[PDB]
Coordinates of C-alpha atoms and ligand atoms in Angstrom, one line a residue:
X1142 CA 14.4 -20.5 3.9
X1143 CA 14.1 -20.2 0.1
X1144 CA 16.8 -18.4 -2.3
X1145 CA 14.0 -17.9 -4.6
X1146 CA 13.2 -14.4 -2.2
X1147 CA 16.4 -12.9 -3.2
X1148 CA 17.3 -11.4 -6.2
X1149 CA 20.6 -9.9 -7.3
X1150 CA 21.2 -6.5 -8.9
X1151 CA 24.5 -6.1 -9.5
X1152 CA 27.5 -8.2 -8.8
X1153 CA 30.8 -6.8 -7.7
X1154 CA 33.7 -7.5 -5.1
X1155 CA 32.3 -8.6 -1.8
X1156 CA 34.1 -6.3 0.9
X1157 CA 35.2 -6.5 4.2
X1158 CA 32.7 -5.0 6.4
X1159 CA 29.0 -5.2 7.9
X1160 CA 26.2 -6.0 5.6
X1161 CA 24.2 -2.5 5.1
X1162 CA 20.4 -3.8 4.9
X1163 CA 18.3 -0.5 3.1
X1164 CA 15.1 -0.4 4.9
X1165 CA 12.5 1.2 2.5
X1166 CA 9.2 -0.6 2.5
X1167 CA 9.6 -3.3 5.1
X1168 CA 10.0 -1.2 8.7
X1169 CA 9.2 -3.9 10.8
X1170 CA 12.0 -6.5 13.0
X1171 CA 9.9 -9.7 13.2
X1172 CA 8.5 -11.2 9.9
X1173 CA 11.1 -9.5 7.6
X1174 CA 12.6 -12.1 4.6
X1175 CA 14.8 -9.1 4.1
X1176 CA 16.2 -8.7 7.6
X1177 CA 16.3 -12.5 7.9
X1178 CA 18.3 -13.0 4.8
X1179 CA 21.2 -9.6 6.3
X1180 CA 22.1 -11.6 9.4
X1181 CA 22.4 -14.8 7.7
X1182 CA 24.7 -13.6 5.1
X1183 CA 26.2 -11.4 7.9
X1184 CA 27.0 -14.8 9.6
X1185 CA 28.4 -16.8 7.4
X1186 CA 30.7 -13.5 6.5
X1187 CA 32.3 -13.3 9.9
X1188 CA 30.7 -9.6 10.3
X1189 CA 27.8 -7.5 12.0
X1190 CA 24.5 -6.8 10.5
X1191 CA 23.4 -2.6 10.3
X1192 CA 20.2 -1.8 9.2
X1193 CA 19.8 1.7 7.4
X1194 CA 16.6 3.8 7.0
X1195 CA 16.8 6.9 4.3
X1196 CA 14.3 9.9 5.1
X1197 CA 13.7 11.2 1.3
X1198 CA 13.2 14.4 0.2
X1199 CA 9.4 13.3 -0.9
X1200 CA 7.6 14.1 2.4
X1201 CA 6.5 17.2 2.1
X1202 CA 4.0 15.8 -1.1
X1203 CA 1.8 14.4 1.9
X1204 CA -0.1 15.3 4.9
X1205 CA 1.8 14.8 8.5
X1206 CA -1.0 11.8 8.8
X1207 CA 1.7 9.6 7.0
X1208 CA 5.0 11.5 8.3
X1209 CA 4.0 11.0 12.2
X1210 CA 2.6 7.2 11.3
X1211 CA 5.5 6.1 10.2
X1212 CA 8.0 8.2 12.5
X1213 CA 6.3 6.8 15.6
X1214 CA 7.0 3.4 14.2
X1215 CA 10.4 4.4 13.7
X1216 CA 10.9 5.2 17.2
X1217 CA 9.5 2.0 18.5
X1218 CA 11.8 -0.3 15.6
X1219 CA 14.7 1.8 16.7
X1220 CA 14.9 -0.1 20.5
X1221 CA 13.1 -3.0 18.8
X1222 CA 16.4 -3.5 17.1
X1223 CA 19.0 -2.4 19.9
X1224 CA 17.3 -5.1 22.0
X1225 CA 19.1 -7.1 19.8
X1226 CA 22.1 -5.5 18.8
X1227 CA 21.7 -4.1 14.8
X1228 CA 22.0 -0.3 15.2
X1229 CA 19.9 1.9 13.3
X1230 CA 20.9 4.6 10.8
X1231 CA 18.8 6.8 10.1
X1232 CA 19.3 9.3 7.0
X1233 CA 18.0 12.7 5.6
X1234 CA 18.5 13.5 1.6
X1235 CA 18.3 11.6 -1.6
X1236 CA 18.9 7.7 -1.2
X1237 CA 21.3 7.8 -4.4
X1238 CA 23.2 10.4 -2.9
X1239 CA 23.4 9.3 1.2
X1240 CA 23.5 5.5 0.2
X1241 CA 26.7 6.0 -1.6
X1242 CA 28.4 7.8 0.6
X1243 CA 27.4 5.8 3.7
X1244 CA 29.0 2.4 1.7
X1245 CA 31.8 4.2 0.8
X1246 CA 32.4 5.9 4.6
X1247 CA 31.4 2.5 6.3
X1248 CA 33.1 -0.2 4.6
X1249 CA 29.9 -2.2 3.4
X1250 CA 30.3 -5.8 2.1
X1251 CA 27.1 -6.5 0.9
X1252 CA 24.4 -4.4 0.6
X1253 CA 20.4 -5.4 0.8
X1254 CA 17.5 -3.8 0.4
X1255 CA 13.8 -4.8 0.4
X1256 CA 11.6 -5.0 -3.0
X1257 CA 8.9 -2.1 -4.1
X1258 CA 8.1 -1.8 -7.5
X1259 CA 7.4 1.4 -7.3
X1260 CA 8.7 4.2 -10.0
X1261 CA 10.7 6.0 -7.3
X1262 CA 12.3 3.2 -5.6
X1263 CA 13.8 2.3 -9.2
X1264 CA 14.7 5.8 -9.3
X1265 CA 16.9 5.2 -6.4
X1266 CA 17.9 1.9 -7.4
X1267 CA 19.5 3.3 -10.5
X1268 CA 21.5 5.7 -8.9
X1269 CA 22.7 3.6 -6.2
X1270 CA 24.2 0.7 -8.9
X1271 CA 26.1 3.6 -10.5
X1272 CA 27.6 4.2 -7.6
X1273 CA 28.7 1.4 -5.4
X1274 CA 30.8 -1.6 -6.5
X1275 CA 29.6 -4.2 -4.3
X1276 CA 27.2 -7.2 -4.4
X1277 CA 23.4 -5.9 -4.7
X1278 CA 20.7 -7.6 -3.8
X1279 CA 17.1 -7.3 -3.0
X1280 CA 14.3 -9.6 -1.3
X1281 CA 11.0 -9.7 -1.4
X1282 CA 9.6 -9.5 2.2
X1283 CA 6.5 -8.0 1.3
X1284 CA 4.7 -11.1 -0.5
X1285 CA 4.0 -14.7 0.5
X1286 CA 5.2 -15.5 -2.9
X1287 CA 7.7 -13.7 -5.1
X1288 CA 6.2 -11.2 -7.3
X1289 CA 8.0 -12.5 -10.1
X1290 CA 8.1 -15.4 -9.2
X1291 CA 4.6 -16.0 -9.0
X1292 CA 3.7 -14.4 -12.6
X1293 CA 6.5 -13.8 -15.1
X1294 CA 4.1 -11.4 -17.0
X1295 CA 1.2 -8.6 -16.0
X1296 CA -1.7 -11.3 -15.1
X1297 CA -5.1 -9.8 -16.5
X1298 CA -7.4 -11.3 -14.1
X1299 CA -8.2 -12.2 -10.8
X1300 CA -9.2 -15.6 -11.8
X1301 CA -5.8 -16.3 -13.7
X1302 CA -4.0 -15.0 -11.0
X1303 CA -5.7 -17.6 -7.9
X1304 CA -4.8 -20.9 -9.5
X1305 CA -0.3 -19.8 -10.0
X1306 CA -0.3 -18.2 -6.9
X1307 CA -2.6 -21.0 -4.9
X1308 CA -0.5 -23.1 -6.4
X1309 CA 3.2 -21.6 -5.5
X1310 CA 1.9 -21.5 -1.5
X1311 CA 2.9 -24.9 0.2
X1312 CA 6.5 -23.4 -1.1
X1313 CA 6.6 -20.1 0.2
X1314 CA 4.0 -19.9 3.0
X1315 CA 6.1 -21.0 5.9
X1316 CA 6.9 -19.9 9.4
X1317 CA 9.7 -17.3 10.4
X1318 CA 12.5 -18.1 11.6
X1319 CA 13.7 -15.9 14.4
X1320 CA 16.2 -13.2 14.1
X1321 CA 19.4 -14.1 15.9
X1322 CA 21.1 -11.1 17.2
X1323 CA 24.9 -10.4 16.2
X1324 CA 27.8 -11.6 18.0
X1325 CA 23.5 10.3 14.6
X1326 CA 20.4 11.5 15.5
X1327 CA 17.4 10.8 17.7
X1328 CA 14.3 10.7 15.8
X1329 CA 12.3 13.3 17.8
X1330 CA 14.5 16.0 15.9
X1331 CA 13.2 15.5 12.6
X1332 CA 9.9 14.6 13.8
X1333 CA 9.6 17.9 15.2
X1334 CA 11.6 20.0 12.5
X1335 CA 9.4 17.9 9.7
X1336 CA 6.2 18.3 11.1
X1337 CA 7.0 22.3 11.3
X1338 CA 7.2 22.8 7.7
X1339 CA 3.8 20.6 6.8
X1340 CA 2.1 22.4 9.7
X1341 CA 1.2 25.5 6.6
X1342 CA -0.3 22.6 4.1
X1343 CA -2.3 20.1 6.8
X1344 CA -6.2 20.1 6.4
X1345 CA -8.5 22.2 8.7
X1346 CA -11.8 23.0 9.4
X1347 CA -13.4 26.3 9.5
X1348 CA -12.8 27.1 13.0
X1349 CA -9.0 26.4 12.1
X1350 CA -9.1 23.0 13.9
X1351 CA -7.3 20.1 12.1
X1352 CA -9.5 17.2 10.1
X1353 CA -7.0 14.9 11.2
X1354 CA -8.4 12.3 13.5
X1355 CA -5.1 10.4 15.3
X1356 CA -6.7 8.0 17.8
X1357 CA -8.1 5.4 15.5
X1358 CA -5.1 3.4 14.1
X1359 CA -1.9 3.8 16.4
X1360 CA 1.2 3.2 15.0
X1361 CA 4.1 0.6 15.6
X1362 CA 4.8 -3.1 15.7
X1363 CA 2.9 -4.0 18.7
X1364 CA -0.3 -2.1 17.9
X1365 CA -0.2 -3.8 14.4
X1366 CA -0.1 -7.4 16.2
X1367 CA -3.2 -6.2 18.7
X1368 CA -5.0 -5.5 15.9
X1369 CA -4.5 -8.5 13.8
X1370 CA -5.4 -10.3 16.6
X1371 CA -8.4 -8.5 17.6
X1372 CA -9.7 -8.7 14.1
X1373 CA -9.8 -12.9 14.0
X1374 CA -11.4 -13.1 17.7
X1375 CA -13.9 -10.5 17.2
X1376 CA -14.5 -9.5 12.9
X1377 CA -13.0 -12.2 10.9
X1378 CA -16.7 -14.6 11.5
X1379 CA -18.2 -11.4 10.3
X1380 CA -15.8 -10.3 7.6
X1381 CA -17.6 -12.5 4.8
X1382 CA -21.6 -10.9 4.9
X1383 CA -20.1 -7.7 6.0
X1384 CA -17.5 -6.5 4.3
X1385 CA -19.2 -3.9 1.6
X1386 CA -21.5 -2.2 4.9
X1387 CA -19.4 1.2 5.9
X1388 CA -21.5 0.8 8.3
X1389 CA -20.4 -1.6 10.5
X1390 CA -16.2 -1.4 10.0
X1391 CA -15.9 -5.3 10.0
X1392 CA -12.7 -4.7 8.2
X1393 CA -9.2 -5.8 9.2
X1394 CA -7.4 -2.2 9.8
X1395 CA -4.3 -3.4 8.7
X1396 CA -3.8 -1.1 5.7
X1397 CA -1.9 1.3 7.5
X1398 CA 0.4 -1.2 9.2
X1399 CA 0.7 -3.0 5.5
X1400 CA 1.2 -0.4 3.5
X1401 CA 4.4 0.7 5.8
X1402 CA 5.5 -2.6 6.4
X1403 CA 4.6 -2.8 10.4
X1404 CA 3.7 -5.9 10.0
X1405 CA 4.0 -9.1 7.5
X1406 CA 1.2 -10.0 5.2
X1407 CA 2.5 -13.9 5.5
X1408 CA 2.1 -13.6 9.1
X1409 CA -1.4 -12.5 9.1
X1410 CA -2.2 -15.1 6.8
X1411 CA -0.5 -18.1 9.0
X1412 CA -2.6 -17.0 11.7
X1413 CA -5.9 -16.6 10.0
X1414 CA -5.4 -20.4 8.6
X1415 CA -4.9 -21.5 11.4
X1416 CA -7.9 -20.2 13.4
X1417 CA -11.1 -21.8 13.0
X1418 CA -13.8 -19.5 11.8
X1419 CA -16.8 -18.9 9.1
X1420 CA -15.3 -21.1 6.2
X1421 CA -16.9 -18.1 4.0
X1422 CA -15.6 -15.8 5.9
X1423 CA -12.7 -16.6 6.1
X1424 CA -11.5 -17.6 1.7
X1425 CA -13.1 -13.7 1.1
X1426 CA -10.3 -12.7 3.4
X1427 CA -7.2 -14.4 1.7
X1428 CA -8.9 -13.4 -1.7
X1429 CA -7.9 -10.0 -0.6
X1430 CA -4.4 -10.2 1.3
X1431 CA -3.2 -12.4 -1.1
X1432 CA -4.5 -12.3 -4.5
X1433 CA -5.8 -8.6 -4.8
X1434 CA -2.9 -7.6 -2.9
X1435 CA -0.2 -9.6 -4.6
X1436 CA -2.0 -8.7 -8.0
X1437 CA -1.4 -5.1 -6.8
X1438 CA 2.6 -6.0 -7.0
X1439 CA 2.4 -7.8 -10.4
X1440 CA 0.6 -4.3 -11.7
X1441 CA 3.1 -2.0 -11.4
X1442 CA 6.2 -4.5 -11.6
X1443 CA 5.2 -5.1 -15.3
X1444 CA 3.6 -2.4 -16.3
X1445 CA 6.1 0.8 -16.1
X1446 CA 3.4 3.3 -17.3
X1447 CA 0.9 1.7 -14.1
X1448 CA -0.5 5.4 -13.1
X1449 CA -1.4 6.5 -17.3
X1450 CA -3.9 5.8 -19.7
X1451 CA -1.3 3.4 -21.8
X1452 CA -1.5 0.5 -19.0
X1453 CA -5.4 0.4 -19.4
X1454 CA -6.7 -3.1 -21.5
X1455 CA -7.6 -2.4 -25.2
X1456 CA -11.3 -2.5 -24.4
X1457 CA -11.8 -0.3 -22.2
X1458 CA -9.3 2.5 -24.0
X1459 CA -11.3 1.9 -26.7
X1460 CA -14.8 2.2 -24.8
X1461 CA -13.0 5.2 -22.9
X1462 CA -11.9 7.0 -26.2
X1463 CA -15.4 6.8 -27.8
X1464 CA -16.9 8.5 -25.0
X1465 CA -14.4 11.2 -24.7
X1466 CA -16.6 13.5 -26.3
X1467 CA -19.9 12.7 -24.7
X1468 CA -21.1 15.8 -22.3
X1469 CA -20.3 15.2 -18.7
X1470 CA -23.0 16.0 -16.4
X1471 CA -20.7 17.8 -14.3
X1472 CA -17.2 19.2 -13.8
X1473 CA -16.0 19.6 -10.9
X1474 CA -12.2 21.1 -9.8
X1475 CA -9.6 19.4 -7.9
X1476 CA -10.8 22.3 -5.3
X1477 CA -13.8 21.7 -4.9
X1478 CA -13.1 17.4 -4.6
X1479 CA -10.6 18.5 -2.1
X1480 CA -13.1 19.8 0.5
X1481 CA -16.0 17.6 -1.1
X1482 CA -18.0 20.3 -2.6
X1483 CA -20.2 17.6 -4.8
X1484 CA -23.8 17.4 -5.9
X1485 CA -23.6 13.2 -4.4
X1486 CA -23.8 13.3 -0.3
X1487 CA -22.4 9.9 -0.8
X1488 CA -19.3 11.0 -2.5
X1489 CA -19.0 13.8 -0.2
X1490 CA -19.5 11.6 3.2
X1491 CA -16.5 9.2 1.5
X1492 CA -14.5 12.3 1.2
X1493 CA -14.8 13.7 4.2
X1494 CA -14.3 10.2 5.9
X1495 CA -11.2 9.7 4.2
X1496 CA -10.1 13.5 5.6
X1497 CA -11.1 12.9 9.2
X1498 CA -9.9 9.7 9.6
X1499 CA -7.4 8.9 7.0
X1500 CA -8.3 5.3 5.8
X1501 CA -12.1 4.8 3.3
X1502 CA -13.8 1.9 3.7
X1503 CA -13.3 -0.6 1.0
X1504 CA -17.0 -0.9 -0.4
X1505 CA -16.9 3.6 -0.9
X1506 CA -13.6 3.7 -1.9
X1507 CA -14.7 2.4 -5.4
X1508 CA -17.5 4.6 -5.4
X1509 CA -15.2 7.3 -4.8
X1510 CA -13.3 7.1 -7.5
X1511 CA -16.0 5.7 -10.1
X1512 CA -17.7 9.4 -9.8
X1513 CA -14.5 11.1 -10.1
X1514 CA -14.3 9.6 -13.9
X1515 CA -17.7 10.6 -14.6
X1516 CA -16.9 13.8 -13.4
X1517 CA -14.1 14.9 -15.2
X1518 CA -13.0 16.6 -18.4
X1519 CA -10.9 13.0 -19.5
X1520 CA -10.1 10.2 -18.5
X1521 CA -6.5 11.4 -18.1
X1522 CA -7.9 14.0 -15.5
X1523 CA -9.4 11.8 -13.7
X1524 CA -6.8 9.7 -13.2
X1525 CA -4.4 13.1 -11.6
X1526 CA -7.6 14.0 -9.7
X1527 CA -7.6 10.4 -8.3
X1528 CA -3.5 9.7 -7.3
X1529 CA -3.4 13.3 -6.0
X1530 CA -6.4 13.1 -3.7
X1531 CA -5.5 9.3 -2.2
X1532 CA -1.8 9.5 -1.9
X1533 CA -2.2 12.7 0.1
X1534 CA -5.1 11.9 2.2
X1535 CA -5.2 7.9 2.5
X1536 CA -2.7 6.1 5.2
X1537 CA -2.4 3.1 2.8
X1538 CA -1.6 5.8 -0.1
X1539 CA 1.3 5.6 -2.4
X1540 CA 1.2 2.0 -2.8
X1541 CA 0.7 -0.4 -5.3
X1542 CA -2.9 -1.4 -3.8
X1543 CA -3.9 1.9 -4.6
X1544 CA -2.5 2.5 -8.5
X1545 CA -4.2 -1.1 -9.3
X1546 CA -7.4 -0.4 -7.5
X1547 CA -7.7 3.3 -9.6
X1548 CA -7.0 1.5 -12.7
X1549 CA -9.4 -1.2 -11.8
X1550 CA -12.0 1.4 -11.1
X1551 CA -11.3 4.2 -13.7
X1552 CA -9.6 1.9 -16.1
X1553 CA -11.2 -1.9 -15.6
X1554 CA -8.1 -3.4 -15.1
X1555 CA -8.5 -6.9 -13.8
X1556 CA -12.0 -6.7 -14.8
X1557 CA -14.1 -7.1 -17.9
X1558 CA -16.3 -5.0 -19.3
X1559 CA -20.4 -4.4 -18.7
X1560 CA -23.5 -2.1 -20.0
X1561 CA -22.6 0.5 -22.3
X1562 CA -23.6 4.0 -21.3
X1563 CA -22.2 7.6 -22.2
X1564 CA -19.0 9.1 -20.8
X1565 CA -18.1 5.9 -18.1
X1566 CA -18.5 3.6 -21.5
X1567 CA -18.4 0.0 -20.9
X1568 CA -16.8 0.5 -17.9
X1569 CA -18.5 -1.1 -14.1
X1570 CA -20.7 1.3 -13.3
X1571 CA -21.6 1.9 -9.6
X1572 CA -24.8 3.9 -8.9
X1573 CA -26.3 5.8 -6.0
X1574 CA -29.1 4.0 -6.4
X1575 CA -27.7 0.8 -6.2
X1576 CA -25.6 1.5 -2.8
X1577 CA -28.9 2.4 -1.4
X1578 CA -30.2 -1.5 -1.9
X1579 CA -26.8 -3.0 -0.2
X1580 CA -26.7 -0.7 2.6
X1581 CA -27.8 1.8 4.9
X1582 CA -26.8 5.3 3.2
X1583 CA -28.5 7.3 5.5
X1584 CA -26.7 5.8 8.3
X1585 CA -23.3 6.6 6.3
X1586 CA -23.9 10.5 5.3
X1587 CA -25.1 11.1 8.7
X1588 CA -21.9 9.9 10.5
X1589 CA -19.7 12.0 8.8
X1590 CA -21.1 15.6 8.5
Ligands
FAD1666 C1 -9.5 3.3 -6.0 C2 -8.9 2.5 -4.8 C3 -7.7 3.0 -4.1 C4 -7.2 2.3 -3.1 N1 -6.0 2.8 -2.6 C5 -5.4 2.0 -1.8 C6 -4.1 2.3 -1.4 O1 -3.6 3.4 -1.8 N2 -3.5 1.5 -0.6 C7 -4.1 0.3 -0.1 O2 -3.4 -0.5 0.7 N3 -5.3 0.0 -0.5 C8 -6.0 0.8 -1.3 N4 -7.2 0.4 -1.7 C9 -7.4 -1.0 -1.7 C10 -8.4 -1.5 -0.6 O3 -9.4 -0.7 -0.6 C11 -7.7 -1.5 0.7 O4 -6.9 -2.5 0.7 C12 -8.6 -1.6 1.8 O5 -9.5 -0.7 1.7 C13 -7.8 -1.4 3.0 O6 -8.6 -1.3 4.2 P1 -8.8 -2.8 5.1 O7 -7.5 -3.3 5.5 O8 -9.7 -2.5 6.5 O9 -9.6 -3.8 4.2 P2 -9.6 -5.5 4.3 O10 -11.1 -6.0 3.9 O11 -9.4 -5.9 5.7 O12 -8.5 -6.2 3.3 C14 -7.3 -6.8 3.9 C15 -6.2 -6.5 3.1 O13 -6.4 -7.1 1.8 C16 -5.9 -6.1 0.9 N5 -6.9 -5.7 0.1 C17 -8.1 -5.6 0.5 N6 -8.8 -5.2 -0.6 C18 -8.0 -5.0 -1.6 C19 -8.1 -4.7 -3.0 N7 -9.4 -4.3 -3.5 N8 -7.0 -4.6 -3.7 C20 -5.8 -5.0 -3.2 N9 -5.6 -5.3 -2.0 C21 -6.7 -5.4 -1.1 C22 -5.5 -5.0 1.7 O14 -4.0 -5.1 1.8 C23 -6.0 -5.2 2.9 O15 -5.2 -4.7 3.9 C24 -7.7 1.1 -2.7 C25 -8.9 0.6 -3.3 C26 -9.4 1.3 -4.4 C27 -10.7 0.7 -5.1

């Protein structure tokens, strides 16, 4: 228990009803701050917790990959949460719009909801405050420590971002309380009704069969736990050598259960420290889930313009700008990316991994988008070209992980600069020939035709 999680928003006059908690990027029951900290000012108020999840009107701008992920989850939080009596809301429109008529038409007291910088959930935000007079607050329940209040500025490094977070643990890494219970629409309808109108826009083959693979990451709270588990006992003594060869997936596989907030990123860490493993192995792995993916957080929450040209560091715009005019070596279309259509079997293996199966390795996803920049008319195209093709295709897409990870591969953000050669500039360059010393590329093209 720390107040330092929750932040208010707007103060007004606490009512006389339940406290409203606004599920957006935390869909999970255990290991939520945000759920924790509804019930325990639910308590103390002499009232019930309700928990309330909007469907936005954003859905059809990605595949059904995402919409059937985080649906089935849905289902399973729905009697995860009658089991201990919070009911679950769930509603279809703009949050600004169904938000303020549910506190109005319910009698809220105080209303919570759970932290995402993110442009669009301060799009909601800012229609909600102008629309509601009580208490607002949010908590972060996605970090181990606060996002701002581990850095109170955009840190510009990885290695200036270890020592304040390292350092801000013993105080916020601690074990979860449990979730003491209190004292319409079934969600196959619009599974069924969505999936119907993205059924014209999924991906297909040519014999009109669906790319879509759906048996390698199942969805839901309990899955995510198997696979946490499953990854220290069998991958996490292999996770340090390993990590950059597609071609063993020593990875965690938790992307798609982070990303959707299926499961707790201070969890996983609590039980990784306390397993006894590689001792390599094992910092490489908290160097990702906590300081790359934290960092990820600090991106977008002070940088507003995270996803343009303007958030890039002044040497690299400046290395970027001077190679503007250099001729590309090719040009390829957002087309012919789509259905990788590229001269590089290597980009076109990533590309086609990513459609089949819905999550690229780590080690080809900066490959991936390295070549998009050197194939592209600007900079600023490649930047479209690279949002557009991972938040429609990648489970783990439209998250902060991925706007910091295509900035730090287009844009060297959190890194510094290297060789100066035409178009790509001073930028980390990552060649074919190079991949072919750290791993097995033939083995990679050749499992995904
Ligand atoms: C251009 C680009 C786009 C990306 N797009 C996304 C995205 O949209 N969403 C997303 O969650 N990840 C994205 N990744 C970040 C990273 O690739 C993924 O976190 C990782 O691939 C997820 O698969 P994993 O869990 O099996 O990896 P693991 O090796 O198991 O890593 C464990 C966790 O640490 C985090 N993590 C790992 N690597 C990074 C990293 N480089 N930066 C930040 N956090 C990291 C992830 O949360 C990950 O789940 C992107 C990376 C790049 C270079």
């Amino acid at each position: 228990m720390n107040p330092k999680r929750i932040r208010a928003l707007k103060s007004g006059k606490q009512g006389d009803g339940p406290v409203v908690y606004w599920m957006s990027r935390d869909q999970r029951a255990e290991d939520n701050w945000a759920l924790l900290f509804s019930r325990a000012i639910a308590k103390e108020a002499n009232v019930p917790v309700v928990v309330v999840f909007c469907l936005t009107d954003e859905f059809l701008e990605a595949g059904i990959r995402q919409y059937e992920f985080m649906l089935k989850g849905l289902q399973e939080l729905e009697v995860s949460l009658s089991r201990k009596k919070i009911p679950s809301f769930f509603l279809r429109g703009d949050p600004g719009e169904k938000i303020s008529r549910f506190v109005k038409d319910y009698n809220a007291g105080t209303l919570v909801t759970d932290f995402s910088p993110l442009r669009i959930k301060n799009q909601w935000i800012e229609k909600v405050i102008s629309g509601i007079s009580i208490p607002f607050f949010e908590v972060d329940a996605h970090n181990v420590v606060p996002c701002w209040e581990a850095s109170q500025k955009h840190e510009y490094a990885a290695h200036t971002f270890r020592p304040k977070l390292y350092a801000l643990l013993p105080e916020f890494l601690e074990e979860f309380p449990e979730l003491e219970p209190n004292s319409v629409e079934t969600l196959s309808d619009v599974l069924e009704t969505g999936v119907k109108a993205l059924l014209p826009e999924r991906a297909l083959l040519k014999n009109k069969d669906p790319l879509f693979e759906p048996w390698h990451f199942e969805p839901g709270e309990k899955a995510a736990k198997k696979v946490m588990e499953s990854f220290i006992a069998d991958r996490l003594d292999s996770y340090g050598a390993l990590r950059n060869d597609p071609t063993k997936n020593m990875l965690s596989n938790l992307s798609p259960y982070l990303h959707f907030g299926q499961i707790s990123s201070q969890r996983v860490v609590l039980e990784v420290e306390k397993a006894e493993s590689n001792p390599g192995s094992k910092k490489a792995f908290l160097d990702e889930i906590l300081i790359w993916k934290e960092i990820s957080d600090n991106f977008c929450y002070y940088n507003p313009g995270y996803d343009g040209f303007e958030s890039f560091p002044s040497w690299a715009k400046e290395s970027l700008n001077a190679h503007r005019n250099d001729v590309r070596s090719h040009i390829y279309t957002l087309e012919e990316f789509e259905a990788g259509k590229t001269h590089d079997p290597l980009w076109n293996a990533s590309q086609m991994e990513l459609l089949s199966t819905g999550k690229m390795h780590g080690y080809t996803r900066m490959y991936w988008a390295k070549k998009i920049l050197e194939w592209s008319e600007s900079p600023e195209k490649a930047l479209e070209i690279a949002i557009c093709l991972n938040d429609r295709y990648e489970l783990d897409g439209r998250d902060p992980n991925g706007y910091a990870g295509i900035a730090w591969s287009i844009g060297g953000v959190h890194d510094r600069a290297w060789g100066e050669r035409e178009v790509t500039g001073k930028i980390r360059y990552m060649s074919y020939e190079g991949c072919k010393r750290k791993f097995d590329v033939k083995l990679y093209i050749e499992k995904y035709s």
